[PDB]
Amino acid sequence: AMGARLITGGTVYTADAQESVHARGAVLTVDDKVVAVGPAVEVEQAVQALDPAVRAELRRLDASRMMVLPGFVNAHWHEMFAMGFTMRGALRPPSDRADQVAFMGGGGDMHQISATFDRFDGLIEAMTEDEARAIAEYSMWIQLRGGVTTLGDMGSLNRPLAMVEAARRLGMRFSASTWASDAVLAPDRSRFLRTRDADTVLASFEALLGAVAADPTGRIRCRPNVSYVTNMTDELARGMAELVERHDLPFATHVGALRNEADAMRAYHGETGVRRLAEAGLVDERLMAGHSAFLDDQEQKLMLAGRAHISHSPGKYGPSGESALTETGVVPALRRAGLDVSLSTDAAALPGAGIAETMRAAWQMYNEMSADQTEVLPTDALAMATRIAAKGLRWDDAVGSLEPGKQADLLLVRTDDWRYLLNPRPLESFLWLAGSADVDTVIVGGRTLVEGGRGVEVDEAALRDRYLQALRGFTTRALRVPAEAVDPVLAEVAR
Amino acid sequence: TENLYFQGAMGARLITGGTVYTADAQESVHARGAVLTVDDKVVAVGPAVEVEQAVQALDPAVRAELRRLDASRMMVLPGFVNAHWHEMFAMGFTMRGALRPPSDRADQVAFMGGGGDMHQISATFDRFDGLIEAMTEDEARAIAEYSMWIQLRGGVTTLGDMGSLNRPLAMVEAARRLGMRFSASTWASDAVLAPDRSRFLRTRDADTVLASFEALLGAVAADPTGRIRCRPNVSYVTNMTDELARGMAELVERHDLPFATHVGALRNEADAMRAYHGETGVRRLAEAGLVDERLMAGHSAFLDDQEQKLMLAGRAHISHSPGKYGPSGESALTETGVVPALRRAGLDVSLSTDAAALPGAGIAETMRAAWQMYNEMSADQTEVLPTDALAMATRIAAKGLRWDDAVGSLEPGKQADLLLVRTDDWRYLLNPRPLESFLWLAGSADVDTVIVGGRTLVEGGRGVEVDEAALRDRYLQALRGFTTRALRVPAEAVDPVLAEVAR
Ligand SMILES: Nc1c(O)cccc1C(=O)O
Ligand SMILES: Nc1c(O)cccc1C(=O)O
Ligand SMILES: [Mg+2]
Ligand SMILES: [Zn+2]
Ligand SMILES: [Zn+2]
C-alpha cells in the first residue's frame, strides 16, 4: 500500500469538469486514490480526517516550486520502435536536402499505406517474444518519461502480450489492442482484396481480452481497433460492432485521415470511411476516430449525432506531410460544435512529439486558424490530453483528472526557472518553453515511477541497451537490413 | 572602449566530434564535423579529419594555445539571428502579464486577436514615446539587460530591435555588457487612428522621429566591438505619415542602411488603412520607395496580389513569427497562406520570435512551429526541411538584417558565433539528424553553450560572465519602479507578485 501522500504548495491543474486551477493548491492521496484536492487549507482538513496510523506515516512533498498536472492520457499511440532502422529512421543521410514527399504526404499514397498496414501481421509473427518485450518496454518507458500515465494502443508493430508485460513491469496504465487488417487496396484491382477472415481477426482480439480479463492491478484494459478503414471489410466492421456491444468496450480506428482516402474508399469499397463505419453501427459514443478531418457534411453530422470522439495529433502532421488540421478545418469546427476532441501523439519508429509538444501545437495552431487566443486555452489543451482523452478511452471512471475518488496519477514539473518567472499561469509558460523532458515526477496509483526526470525502479540505460540488442536482431533477421549497415550505427550510440 | 566589457583575445579553438550544421549556402551538415576558430572568426569547418589538417597549418604559437572542445556528445549550430524582436519586459505587469488570474477560463479575444482592434493597437503604439521618456536610465539598463540575456540564453547571438519600449542606448549598453550582437533601433510612431476622426491624427513631427534615429546612428558609429549596428524602423504602417515614410527612405539611402516595419499583420488592417490613410500598407511603403531589398517586413501576410507582386519585384524580405500567432489571436499564417506562397515564389522569408512582456517562444520554438505548420498546410514534409528552419533563423535572417557579411553561417571568414546542444539523451538516440530530434523534443532551454566572436558566454546552460540571479533581481526592482510610477499600477497589486518570486 502507498499510504497517504500530501503534495502541497504548487499550482495544481485538476482538469476537473470546471478545468479548476488552484494556486498554492494541494493533493491528498491515500493508497491508489485522490482523497482531497483544492486550496491547501481545505486539504489540511482532509489530512486531519485520516486514520491516525495512516496520518503518522503521511509523506509530505513541498511542491511550492512546482506545477501539479493530472497524468497524461495518450489514447492514440502505436508501438513502432522495431522499425527504427527503416521508417524515417537511423539509416537516413544526415543531410535532409534530398527528402521526397512519400507515404502519408502529398494527400497519401493509398496503395502503399494499405499494403504496409496489411504486412504488420507477418512482421509481428517474425518478431521474437524477447525482442517484442525489450522494444515495447523501452518504447513505453519513453511515453511514461514524458508524463503518459495511461497509454492507448491503436495498432502496433509489436506482440500484444509483450506490451501488456512491459506496462505491468513499468507500473503505467495500458489499453492493449491487436492488429486488425483484413483487406488491401492493390494497384492491379478495381475492388478491395480480402487478405484474411474477419472472424479469425476478431478471435485474435478475443484471445487478448481473455488474457487481461483476470488483471488485478487495475492498470490493464483492452480496446479493439481496426488498423484503417481502407483495410476493413464490412464483415470485420459488423464483427467489431457485435464484439464491443457484447463486452461493453470502447472501439478505435483511423478514418478521414488523408486527402486521397475518400476517392480510394469509393473506388475499392463503394463508400467513404465514416459512412461505412456508420452502416456497421460503429459511429457512436464508443468510437475514437484517429485524425477524422476529411469528412463531408453528412459524415460530420453522423459523428455529432453519434457523440463519437476524435483523437487529433497536430504535433506530428507536418513532418509526415499530413494536412489533417488546416486543409479542411473540420476537427476544430467539430470541437466548437461540442464533439469530444482529444490530443494524442500518434507514433513513429524514433522519438517524436510527446503529449506536452502536442498540447503546445494545439494551443498555437487551433488559435491561429480562428484568430482567437481563447479557442484552445492552455487548460483546454491540458483537458484534451487528460480528462477528454480518458473519456474517449472509456477510462474517465478512474483517470484523466485530479478529483476525489479518481486514481492518484499525477505529474510534477519544476517552475522555479526563468521560463516561469512572474507568470501566474505556469501551464502557459510550460506550453511556451517546456516539453516532455521537463516532466520531473510521474506518480501512478500513488506510486512514484519517475523523480527528477529519472526512473525510480526503471534503469533507463539497461532498457536502452536491451532495446538496441532486440532492434539489431529484428532489423537484420526480419527486415533483412545488412549487419554492415546496422552495426556502425549501434557503435555510434553515446552510452 | 571594448575593454570595459570583456578582456583578452580568444586565440584558436577546435570544436570537434559532433554533428555540425553550417547553414552555409549549400545547407551543409557534417556528421563528426569540426569548427576551427581563431580569435573572432571561423577559419575551417568540415569533416573532423579535414579540419585537423587546418590545425596543423596554424601559426605555431597559436597552435600551442589551441583550446580543444570535445563536442562528440553535441550538435553544433550557427548562433541564432533573431532579426524581429521587441524589448517589452517593462510591460510584464499589464501585457498578458503578471496580474492575470491563474485560471484562463474568463480570457477574452482582445488586442491583436479577432482580426485586430486597430484603434487600440494604434493608440497603444503611439503611447510608447511617453512611456520610454518616463523610464529612468537605471530602469532601462536593468530591464534591457535581463530581457536580452533571456534571448542570449536561448542561443540568440545576433538580435534585431524592430521597436522597443526601452531606451535605445540602454539596449546598446546591455548588448555590450552581455557580449552579444545587436541591431539597435528607435521608436517611430507619428500618427494614430482614433475612433472619432476621418483621417489619421499626426502625433509628432516626422523630423523629430528621424532626428531620434540619427542620434542613435551617431552614438553607435564609434563602436569598436563589431557587435553593434542599427536599423531604422517604423512601428506599424497605421502609425506612419507619408512624411515619415519618405524621410525613412531618404535616411536609409543616404546612410546605406536596412529598413524594417510591420505591415499586412492583421485581417482588419487593410480597411483601417483605407479609412485613415486612403491606401493599404504595402502600397503606401511602395509609394515612399521603401519596398526594395533593404526592407524587412514583419508578418506581411495580409497582402493582395498587387502587394505580393510589389514585394517580389522589390526583392524585399519577410520576417515571420509562427511560434506566437495563436496565443495573440493572430492569423498571419493560415488565413491567407501568403507568406509560405511568397517563399515558394523565391522571396526571402526568415523566422523570428516577435516579443511579449514575459518569456514566450524563442527561436528554437519558432523553428519547430515553421517545420510543423508550413509542411502541414502544403501536405508536404519537404516544404520546410529542418535545415530550412535553421537557415530561416540564421543565414536568411542575417541577409534580411544586412549582417550576413559577418554572421548567420559557419563558413571561413564569418564570425565564430556558435551554439552547442547536448544530443546524448533519449530524444536523439539513433537519429542521424539531431536537428530533427531538437525540433521534435527540445527548445531554448536545451541550448548548452553559446559562443560569440570565439568567446563562451553560456556553458552548461549557465552564464559564464552573467550573474543570472543578480540580473533577475535588478530587473524585478526596475520593473517595480516603472510599473508603480509610469504605468500607475498600485504597489498593493505589484508587491505581492514580487513577494511570490522563487529565488
Ligand atoms: N497517420 C495515419 C494516416 O495519415 C492514415 C492512416 C493511419 C494513420 C495512423 O495514425 O496510423
Ligand atoms: N504582432 C504585431 C501585429 O499583429 C500588428 C502590428 C505589429 C505587430 C508587432 O509585431 O509589433
Ligand atoms: Mg473566423
Ligand atoms: Zn495512428
Ligand atoms: Zn513585431
Tab-separated table of N, CA and C in Angstrom, chain B residues 366-488:
chain	number	residue	atom	x	y	z
B	366	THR	N	10.232	28.593	-32.510
B	366	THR	CA	9.761	29.141	-33.800
B	366	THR	C	10.170	28.222	-34.951
B	367	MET	N	11.374	27.671	-34.903
B	367	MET	CA	11.832	26.718	-35.944
B	367	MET	C	10.917	25.487	-35.943
B	368	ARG	N	10.583	24.946	-34.769
B	368	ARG	CA	9.663	23.795	-34.698
B	368	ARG	C	8.331	24.191	-35.326
B	369	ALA	N	7.810	25.345	-34.963
B	369	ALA	CA	6.489	25.793	-35.448
B	369	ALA	C	6.500	25.855	-36.975
B	370	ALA	N	7.523	26.440	-37.590
B	370	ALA	CA	7.557	26.575	-39.064
B	370	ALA	C	7.592	25.181	-39.694
B	371	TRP	N	8.408	24.296	-39.145
B	371	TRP	CA	8.567	22.914	-39.655
B	371	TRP	C	7.226	22.197	-39.610
B	372	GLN	N	6.525	22.261	-38.484
B	372	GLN	CA	5.196	21.620	-38.362
B	372	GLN	C	4.208	22.313	-39.312
B	373	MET	N	4.124	23.633	-39.225
B	373	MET	CA	2.931	24.358	-39.714
B	373	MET	C	3.028	24.590	-41.218
B	374	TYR	N	4.186	24.967	-41.748
B	374	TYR	CA	4.283	25.195	-43.210
B	374	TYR	C	4.055	23.860	-43.921
B	375	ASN	N	4.600	22.790	-43.367
B	375	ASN	CA	4.529	21.457	-44.012
B	375	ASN	C	3.107	20.905	-43.949
B	376	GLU	N	2.401	21.107	-42.847
B	376	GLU	CA	1.012	20.608	-42.722
B	376	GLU	C	0.138	21.363	-43.722
B	377	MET	N	0.352	22.670	-43.879
B	377	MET	CA	-0.526	23.479	-44.758
B	377	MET	C	-0.450	22.985	-46.199
B	378	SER	N	0.727	22.539	-46.626
B	378	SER	CA	1.014	22.127	-48.023
B	378	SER	C	0.950	20.607	-48.196
B	379	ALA	N	0.684	19.846	-47.133
B	379	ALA	CA	0.733	18.366	-47.183
B	379	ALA	C	2.083	17.954	-47.771
B	380	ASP	N	3.160	18.551	-47.271
B	380	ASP	CA	4.489	18.396	-47.902
B	380	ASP	C	5.558	18.484	-46.821
B	381	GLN	N	6.126	17.346	-46.445
B	381	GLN	CA	7.159	17.299	-45.381
B	381	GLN	C	8.484	17.872	-45.891
B	382	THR	N	8.550	18.317	-47.144
B	382	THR	CA	9.802	18.874	-47.714
B	382	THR	C	9.697	20.382	-47.936
B	383	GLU	N	8.569	21.021	-47.621
B	383	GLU	CA	8.441	22.465	-47.924
B	383	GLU	C	9.394	23.255	-47.018
B	384	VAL	N	9.354	22.978	-45.721
B	384	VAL	CA	10.364	23.465	-44.742
B	384	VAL	C	11.053	22.227	-44.178
B	385	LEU	N	12.230	21.911	-44.678
B	385	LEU	CA	13.070	20.865	-44.059
B	385	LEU	C	13.620	21.415	-42.748
B	386	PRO	N	14.001	20.568	-41.770
B	386	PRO	CA	14.633	21.101	-40.565
B	386	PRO	C	15.801	22.037	-40.895
B	387	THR	N	16.624	21.714	-41.887
B	387	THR	CA	17.763	22.600	-42.239
B	387	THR	C	17.252	23.917	-42.834
B	388	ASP	N	16.088	23.938	-43.479
B	388	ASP	CA	15.479	25.217	-43.915
B	388	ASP	C	15.062	26.040	-42.701
B	389	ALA	N	14.430	25.424	-41.711
B	389	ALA	CA	14.033	26.156	-40.484
B	389	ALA	C	15.278	26.760	-39.834
B	390	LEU	N	16.376	26.020	-39.813
B	390	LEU	CA	17.635	26.570	-39.261
B	390	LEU	C	18.121	27.739	-40.125
B	391	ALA	N	18.180	27.588	-41.445
B	391	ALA	CA	18.617	28.680	-42.340
B	391	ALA	C	17.739	29.913	-42.099
B	392	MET	N	16.444	29.709	-41.910
B	392	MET	CA	15.485	30.837	-41.748
B	392	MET	C	15.757	31.587	-40.443
B	393	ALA	N	16.388	30.936	-39.467
B	393	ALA	CA	16.680	31.518	-38.138
B	393	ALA	C	18.155	31.921	-38.020
B	394	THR	N	18.944	31.807	-39.091
B	394	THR	CA	20.397	32.090	-39.076
B	394	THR	C	20.734	32.896	-40.337
B	395	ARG	N	21.149	32.233	-41.400
B	395	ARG	CA	21.712	32.890	-42.597
B	395	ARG	C	20.674	33.802	-43.256
B	396	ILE	N	19.455	33.313	-43.449
B	396	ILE	CA	18.456	34.101	-44.211
B	396	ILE	C	18.051	35.309	-43.361
B	397	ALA	N	17.900	35.127	-42.048
B	397	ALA	CA	17.614	36.256	-41.136
B	397	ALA	C	18.749	37.281	-41.202
B	398	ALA	N	19.998	36.819	-41.192
B	398	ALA	CA	21.172	37.712	-41.296
B	398	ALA	C	21.120	38.488	-42.614
B	399	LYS	N	20.728	37.844	-43.707
B	399	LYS	CA	20.616	38.543	-45.004
B	399	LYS	C	19.578	39.660	-44.890
B	400	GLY	N	18.419	39.384	-44.299
B	400	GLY	CA	17.362	40.406	-44.158
B	400	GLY	C	17.811	41.558	-43.275
B	401	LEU	N	18.659	41.266	-42.288
B	401	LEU	CA	19.207	42.268	-41.339
B	401	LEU	C	20.428	42.980	-41.941
B	402	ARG	N	20.934	42.523	-43.086
B	402	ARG	CA	22.184	43.010	-43.734
B	402	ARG	C	23.369	42.806	-42.786
B	403	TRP	N	23.388	41.676	-42.092
B	403	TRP	CA	24.542	41.250	-41.255
B	403	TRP	C	25.120	39.931	-41.772
B	404	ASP	N	24.694	39.467	-42.944
B	404	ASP	CA	25.177	38.160	-43.475
B	404	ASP	C	26.622	38.276	-43.969
B	405	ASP	N	27.184	39.489	-43.992
B	405	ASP	CA	28.627	39.732	-44.246
B	405	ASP	C	29.448	39.076	-43.128
B	406	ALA	N	28.897	38.965	-41.923
B	406	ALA	CA	29.672	38.551	-40.733
B	406	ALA	C	29.014	37.394	-39.982
B	407	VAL	N	27.694	37.241	-40.013
B	407	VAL	CA	27.035	36.226	-39.149
B	407	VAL	C	26.047	35.389	-39.951
B	408	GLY	N	25.484	34.385	-39.281
B	408	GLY	CA	24.363	33.585	-39.806
B	408	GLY	C	24.795	32.257	-40.401
B	409	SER	N	26.091	32.009	-40.579
B	409	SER	CA	26.532	30.688	-41.063
B	409	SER	C	27.956	30.396	-40.610
B	410	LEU	N	28.276	29.117	-40.500
B	410	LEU	CA	29.636	28.667	-40.133
B	410	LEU	C	30.411	28.412	-41.422
B	411	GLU	N	31.168	29.420	-41.833
B	411	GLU	CA	31.974	29.403	-43.077
B	411	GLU	C	33.249	30.167	-42.786
B	412	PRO	N	34.377	29.835	-43.442
B	412	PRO	CA	35.611	30.588	-43.247
B	412	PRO	C	35.398	32.083	-43.502
B	413	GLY	N	35.872	32.907	-42.568
B	413	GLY	CA	35.832	34.376	-42.686
B	413	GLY	C	34.655	34.995	-41.962
B	414	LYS	N	33.631	34.204	-41.614
B	414	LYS	CA	32.476	34.695	-40.822
B	414	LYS	C	32.824	34.636	-39.330
B	415	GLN	N	32.026	35.300	-38.502
B	415	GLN	CA	32.260	35.350	-37.049
B	415	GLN	C	32.037	33.969	-36.432
B	416	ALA	N	32.853	33.657	-35.429
B	416	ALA	CA	32.762	32.428	-34.621
B	416	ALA	C	31.607	32.560	-33.624
B	417	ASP	N	30.381	32.516	-34.145
B	417	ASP	CA	29.135	32.584	-33.348
B	417	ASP	C	28.498	31.204	-33.481
B	418	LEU	N	28.497	30.439	-32.388
B	418	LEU	CA	28.141	29.001	-32.407
B	418	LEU	C	27.269	28.669	-31.207
B	419	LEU	N	26.436	27.641	-31.370
B	419	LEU	CA	25.704	27.015	-30.259
B	419	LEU	C	26.144	25.567	-30.153
B	420	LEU	N	26.161	25.040	-28.943
B	420	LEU	CA	26.250	23.585	-28.713
B	420	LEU	C	24.989	23.155	-27.989
B	421	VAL	N	24.425	22.054	-28.445
B	421	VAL	CA	23.264	21.386	-27.815
B	421	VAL	C	23.670	19.953	-27.501
B	422	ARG	N	23.414	19.476	-26.290
B	422	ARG	CA	23.721	18.072	-25.924
B	422	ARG	C	22.772	17.150	-26.685
B	423	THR	N	23.299	16.071	-27.259
B	423	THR	CA	22.495	15.111	-28.056
B	423	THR	C	22.642	13.693	-27.505
B	424	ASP	N	23.029	13.553	-26.242
B	424	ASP	CA	23.322	12.216	-25.663
B	424	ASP	C	22.107	11.601	-24.961
B	425	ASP	N	20.926	12.229	-24.962
B	425	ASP	CA	19.751	11.692	-24.222
B	425	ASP	C	18.769	11.001	-25.182
B	426	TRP	N	17.743	10.390	-24.606
B	426	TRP	CA	16.740	9.541	-25.295
B	426	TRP	C	16.158	10.243	-26.522
B	427	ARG	N	16.061	11.569	-26.519
B	427	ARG	CA	15.365	12.267	-27.627
B	427	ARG	C	16.104	12.027	-28.940
B	428	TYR	N	17.423	11.866	-28.870
B	428	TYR	CA	18.327	11.901	-30.043
B	428	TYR	C	18.766	10.502	-30.450
B	429	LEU	N	18.430	9.493	-29.658
B	429	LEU	CA	19.011	8.141	-29.825
B	429	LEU	C	18.672	7.593	-31.213
B	430	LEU	N	19.712	7.179	-31.951
B	430	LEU	CA	19.688	6.514	-33.281
B	430	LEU	C	19.382	7.511	-34.397
B	431	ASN	N	19.129	8.785	-34.107
B	431	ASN	CA	18.729	9.715	-35.188
B	431	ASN	C	19.994	10.270	-35.834
B	432	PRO	N	20.248	10.025	-37.137
B	432	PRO	CA	21.380	10.658	-37.812
B	432	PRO	C	21.141	12.150	-38.073
B	433	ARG	N	19.949	12.636	-37.724
B	433	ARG	CA	19.538	14.043	-37.912
B	433	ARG	C	19.204	14.648	-36.557
B	434	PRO	N	20.214	14.976	-35.727
B	434	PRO	CA	19.914	15.520	-34.406
B	434	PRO	C	19.108	16.825	-34.465
B	435	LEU	N	19.230	17.619	-35.527
B	435	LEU	CA	18.416	18.851	-35.629
B	435	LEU	C	16.930	18.475	-35.655
B	436	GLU	N	16.588	17.361	-36.291
B	436	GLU	CA	15.182	16.906	-36.359
B	436	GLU	C	14.700	16.553	-34.950
B	437	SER	N	15.478	15.793	-34.192
B	437	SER	CA	15.136	15.461	-32.785
B	437	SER	C	14.996	16.748	-31.971
B	438	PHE	N	15.887	17.709	-32.194
B	438	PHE	CA	15.842	19.014	-31.496
B	438	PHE	C	14.504	19.706	-31.782
B	439	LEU	N	14.068	19.706	-33.037
B	439	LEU	CA	12.763	20.318	-33.400
B	439	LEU	C	11.611	19.486	-32.825
B	440	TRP	N	11.729	18.168	-32.734
B	440	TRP	CA	10.625	17.364	-32.157
B	440	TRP	C	10.456	17.676	-30.670
B	441	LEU	N	11.561	17.727	-29.912
B	441	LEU	CA	11.503	17.449	-28.456
B	441	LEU	C	12.392	18.372	-27.626
B	442	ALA	N	13.029	19.368	-28.232
B	442	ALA	CA	13.908	20.277	-27.479
B	442	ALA	C	13.517	21.724	-27.736
B	443	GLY	N	14.253	22.634	-27.123
B	443	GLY	CA	13.934	24.055	-27.249
B	443	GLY	C	15.024	24.924	-26.690
B	444	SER	N	14.648	26.155	-26.420
B	444	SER	CA	15.545	27.216	-25.930
B	444	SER	C	16.374	26.728	-24.746
B	445	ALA	N	15.753	26.097	-23.756
B	445	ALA	CA	16.464	25.716	-22.514
B	445	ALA	C	17.493	24.612	-22.781
B	446	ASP	N	17.418	23.926	-23.916
B	446	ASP	CA	18.391	22.866	-24.276
B	446	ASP	C	19.628	23.446	-24.951
B	447	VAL	N	19.670	24.743	-25.205
B	447	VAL	CA	20.940	25.358	-25.652
B	447	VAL	C	21.918	25.221	-24.489
B	448	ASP	N	23.045	24.576	-24.739
B	448	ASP	CA	24.033	24.309	-23.674
B	448	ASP	C	25.097	25.400	-23.668
B	449	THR	N	25.731	25.613	-24.816
B	449	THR	CA	26.860	26.553	-24.936
B	449	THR	C	26.532	27.591	-25.997
B	450	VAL	N	26.860	28.839	-25.716
B	450	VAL	CA	26.701	29.953	-26.679
B	450	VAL	C	28.042	30.662	-26.755
B	451	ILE	N	28.596	30.743	-27.955
B	451	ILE	CA	29.888	31.402	-28.252
B	451	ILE	C	29.617	32.549	-29.216
B	452	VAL	N	30.123	33.733	-28.901
B	452	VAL	CA	30.022	34.913	-29.800
B	452	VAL	C	31.429	35.441	-30.026
B	453	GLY	N	31.849	35.522	-31.283
B	453	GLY	CA	33.194	36.017	-31.632
B	453	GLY	C	34.256	35.205	-30.911
B	454	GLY	N	34.043	33.891	-30.773
B	454	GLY	CA	35.010	32.974	-30.145
B	454	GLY	C	34.947	32.965	-28.630
B	455	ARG	N	34.143	33.823	-28.003
B	455	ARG	CA	34.056	33.908	-26.525
B	455	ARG	C	32.856	33.114	-26.019
B	456	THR	N	33.071	32.222	-25.059
B	456	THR	CA	31.964	31.467	-24.438
B	456	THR	C	31.198	32.389	-23.489
B	457	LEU	N	29.913	32.589	-23.750
B	457	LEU	CA	29.043	33.421	-22.890
B	457	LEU	C	28.102	32.540	-22.074
B	458	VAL	N	27.765	31.354	-22.567
B	458	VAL	CA	26.849	30.396	-21.886
B	458	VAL	C	27.519	29.034	-21.991
B	459	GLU	N	27.554	28.279	-20.897
B	459	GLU	CA	28.127	26.912	-20.886
B	459	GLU	C	27.336	26.074	-19.890
B	460	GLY	N	26.938	24.858	-20.283
B	460	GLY	CA	26.088	24.022	-19.420
B	460	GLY	C	24.782	24.712	-19.090
B	461	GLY	N	24.281	25.549	-19.998
B	461	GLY	CA	23.023	26.288	-19.826
B	461	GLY	C	23.123	27.369	-18.775
B	462	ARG	N	24.332	27.796	-18.414
B	462	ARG	CA	24.550	28.852	-17.393
B	462	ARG	C	25.422	29.973	-17.955
B	463	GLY	N	25.150	31.203	-17.530
B	463	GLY	CA	26.000	32.363	-17.854
B	463	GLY	C	27.417	32.144	-17.355
B	464	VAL	N	28.409	32.445	-18.187
B	464	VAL	CA	29.849	32.342	-17.822
B	464	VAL	C	30.267	33.620	-17.084
B	465	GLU	N	29.946	34.787	-17.647
B	465	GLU	CA	30.230	36.107	-17.022
B	465	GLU	C	28.931	36.696	-16.458
B	466	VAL	N	27.771	36.310	-16.993
B	466	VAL	CA	26.461	36.775	-16.478
B	466	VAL	C	26.251	36.216	-15.069
B	467	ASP	N	25.831	37.077	-14.135
B	467	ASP	CA	25.289	36.694	-12.803
B	467	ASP	C	23.770	36.653	-12.947
B	468	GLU	N	23.218	35.463	-13.145
B	468	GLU	CA	21.804	35.301	-13.560
B	468	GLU	C	20.872	35.844	-12.472
B	469	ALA	N	21.148	35.499	-11.216
B	469	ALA	CA	20.292	35.894	-10.079
B	469	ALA	C	20.343	37.417	-9.936
B	470	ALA	N	21.526	38.005	-10.097
B	470	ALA	CA	21.710	39.464	-9.983
B	470	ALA	C	20.975	40.179	-11.124
B	471	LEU	N	21.075	39.711	-12.370
B	471	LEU	CA	20.350	40.354	-13.496
B	471	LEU	C	18.857	40.288	-13.200
B	472	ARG	N	18.387	39.119	-12.758
B	472	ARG	CA	16.948	38.951	-12.469
B	472	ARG	C	16.514	39.961	-11.402
B	473	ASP	N	17.248	40.028	-10.299
B	473	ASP	CA	16.813	40.855	-9.147
B	473	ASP	C	16.814	42.339	-9.530
B	474	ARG	N	17.788	42.792	-10.322
B	474	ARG	CA	17.837	44.202	-10.788
B	474	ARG	C	16.642	44.468	-11.714
B	475	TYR	N	16.318	43.523	-12.595
B	475	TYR	CA	15.143	43.657	-13.490
B	475	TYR	C	13.869	43.774	-12.656
B	476	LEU	N	13.701	42.933	-11.639
B	476	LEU	CA	12.454	42.956	-10.839
B	476	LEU	C	12.328	44.284	-10.083
B	477	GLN	N	13.426	44.799	-9.537
B	477	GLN	CA	13.420	46.105	-8.829
B	477	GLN	C	13.057	47.220	-9.816
B	478	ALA	N	13.641	47.202	-11.014
B	478	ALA	CA	13.369	48.210	-12.067
B	478	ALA	C	11.902	48.116	-12.488
B	479	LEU	N	11.420	46.896	-12.684
B	479	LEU	CA	10.015	46.656	-13.082
B	479	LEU	C	9.072	47.200	-12.007
B	480	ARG	N	9.394	47.012	-10.726
B	480	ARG	CA	8.552	47.518	-9.616
B	480	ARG	C	8.404	49.035	-9.755
B	481	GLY	N	9.520	49.746	-9.941
B	481	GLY	CA	9.518	51.218	-10.011
B	481	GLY	C	8.736	51.704	-11.214
B	482	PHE	N	9.026	51.153	-12.384
B	482	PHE	CA	8.388	51.582	-13.647
B	482	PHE	C	6.886	51.292	-13.582
B	483	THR	N	6.518	50.117	-13.080
B	483	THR	CA	5.111	49.648	-13.080
B	483	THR	C	4.281	50.546	-12.158
B	484	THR	N	4.797	50.885	-10.981
B	484	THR	CA	4.045	51.698	-9.986
B	484	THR	C	4.033	53.167	-10.413
B	485	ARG	N	5.150	53.697	-10.914
B	485	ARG	CA	5.278	55.147	-11.227
B	485	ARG	C	4.671	55.455	-12.598
B	486	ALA	N	5.168	54.805	-13.652
B	486	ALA	CA	4.860	55.149	-15.057
B	486	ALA	C	3.548	54.499	-15.500
B	487	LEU	N	3.277	53.251	-15.106
B	487	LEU	CA	2.048	52.528	-15.529
B	487	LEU	C	0.942	52.722	-14.489
B	488	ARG	N	1.264	53.292	-13.324
B	488	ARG	CA	0.284	53.684	-12.274
B	488	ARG	C	-0.463	52.446	-11.762
